[PDB]
C-alpha cells in the first residue's frame, strides 16, 4: 500500500494497520509514521524544512490527525534539517541530549534532548522505545523499537541490502559500529521488520549485512 504525493517526492507504505514508512527523495531516506489514537508520531522527519512541511501535510491530511511528535535519530543535516518546521508548528522533537548538542553546535534549533540510553514513550496506544546502542554511523545515532510490532527503525546505523558500502563515514566510528550493531541484535532478539535509513525494509538480516559491510 504505497501512497505517493503530488510529485512522488514523498511516498508512504503501510507496514501494518498503524505504522507506515515514509520515504522522501533528497538518495531516498526513510522514517516511520505512527498512527496513534493521540496523533501522528514521526520517527524522523525529512532532509529539510520544505519536505518536512510536505510530509507533515501529507500525513495530517491522510490520517486526519496532527503530527504531535517526531523522534530524531541523529543530528546530521538530513535528520535535523526540518527542525525549524517542527518547532514552529509545536511539534515535539525528541532526541538524545547528544543529538541536540550536536544540532546546536551545527547551528540548528535544538530538539528536546529528552531521550536517554533507553527511553520508553507511549503515544495513545503506541509504545515506542528509543535505544542508544553506541556509535556507528554517527556518534549519536539511535534506533527506535516498536515493541507491539517488533519493528526496528535502524536509521542510518542500518544499511539496506542494496547498500554495498557504508555511505558517508566522515562522522562514523567504524570500529564501534559493529559493537553497536551487536548491541541492537542483543536487545532485540526477535525482529519482525527493520527499516534501514535508506532502502528497503528488511529483517535482522540488514544488521548482519551492515556488520559485513564493516569488515
Ligand atoms: Zn547521518
From Swiss-Prot:
Zn(2+) 1 binds at residues 74, 76, 137. Zn(2+) 2 binds at residues 78, 156, 198. Its cofactor is Zn(2+). CDD domains: BcII-like_MBL-B1. It is found in: Periplasm. It is an enzyme of class 3 (hydrolase). GO terms for biological process: antibiotic catabolic process; response to antibiotic. It catalyses: a beta-lactam + H2O = a substituted beta-amino acid. Inhibited by captopril stereoisomers and iodoacetate. Also inhibited by chelating agents such as EDTA. Keywords: Antibiotic resistance, Hydrolase, Metal-binding, Periplasm, Signal, Zinc. InterPro entries: BcII-like_MBL-B1, Beta-lactamase_class-B_CS, Metallo-B-lactamas, NDM-1-like, RibonucZ/Hydroxyglut_hydro. Substrate binds at residues 159, 168. One of its GO terms (molecular function) is beta-lactamase activity. PANTHER family: ACYL-COENZYME A THIOESTERASE MBLAC2, METALLO-BETA-LACTAMASE DOMAIN-CONTAINING. NCBIfam families: bla_Bc_2, bla_class_B_core, bla_subclass_B1. Monomer. This is Metallo-beta-lactamase type 2. It comes from Bacillus cereus.
